[PDB]
């Protein structure tokens, strides 16, 4: 995140951290995600595209730091990894960038409810906040586009939803942005999501609930002028989700 504040998981209890194991001894961070229900986490297909070996991913719930432990954290194994069929990327955008992970604990259980672990709510069929809405995004991603390391503490920031009309303008993203994506930016192009935040949530309130409205997906640079961050429009994938989380 560029800008933002540092937080703890008690402020984003639905955020999950996914890491990948390597032979040699290390586990490296991959992407962020969110918890929909006890056994299901949602993230972005591009996070798993280059290495779709579910056995090499670990999912942690209740985590405020990247490489050190938090008391209360739960560790999981990916039981089912579901990527999107019709996932494609171009020189920038990723289309149909949503994925589902079914988590299993080494004792055979799914997430359990604490003060650091909670589910986020889904939106209803193609229902979104109006452009203008301030939503917050969270994650362990870059702090500057030039950094080559991620922060150790969870960060968060507030961004506003912009319209398609403003985003598809030629001097922004043109037609790279489709109806199944959303754009979000800071009025003063000061904060944004960035490399390392992919898969994380974009949460806004809808009809009273804190709803997962978008998933961090792509963007040109970080906090650049007229280059909003682009998110998967979850309200338009509810059919898909449902088909697998039944």
């Amino acid at each position: 995140i560029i800008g933002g504040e540092f937080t703890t998981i008690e402020n984003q209890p639905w955020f999950a951290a996914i890491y990948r194991r390597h032979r040699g001894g290390s586990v490296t961070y991959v992407c962020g995600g969110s918890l929909m229900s006890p056994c299901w986490v949602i993230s972005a297909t591009h996070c798993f595209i280059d290495y779709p070996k579910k056995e090499d991913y670990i999912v942690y719930l209740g985590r405020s730091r990247l490489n050190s432990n938090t008391q209360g954290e739960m560790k999981f194994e990916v039981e089912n990894l579901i990527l999107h069929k019709d996932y494609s990327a171009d020189t920038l955008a990723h289309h149909n960038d949503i994925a589902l992970l079914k988590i299993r604990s080494k004792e055979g259980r799914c997430a359990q409810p604490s003060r650091t672990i909670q589910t986020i709510c889904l939106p209803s069929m193609y229902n979104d906040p109006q452009f203008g809405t301030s939503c917050e995004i969270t994650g362990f991603g870059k702090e500057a586009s030039t950094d080559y390391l991620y922060p150790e503490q969870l960060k968060m920031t507030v961004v506003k939803l912009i319209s398609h009309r403003e985003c598809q303008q030629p001097h922004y993203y043109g037609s790279e942005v489709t109806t199944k994506m959303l754009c979000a930016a800071d009025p003063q192009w000061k904060t944004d999501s960035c490399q390392g935040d992919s898969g994380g949530p974009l949460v806004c309130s809808l009809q009273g609930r804190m709803t997962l409205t978008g998933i961090v997906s792509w963007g040109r640079g970080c906090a650049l002028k007229d280059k909003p961050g682009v998110y998967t429009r979850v309200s338009h994938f509810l059919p898909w989700i449902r088909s697998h989380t039944k």
């Binding site: 008690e10 402020n11 209890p13 639905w14 929909m36 229900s37 006890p38 997430a111 409810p113 909670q118 589910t119 986020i120 709510c121 889904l122 609930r209 804190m210 709803t211």
Partner: peptide, 8 residues
């Protein structure tokens, strides 16, 4: 005492 999606 059980999940309540959206609650902190």
């Amino acid at each position: 005492l059980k999940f309540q999606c959206g609650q902190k």
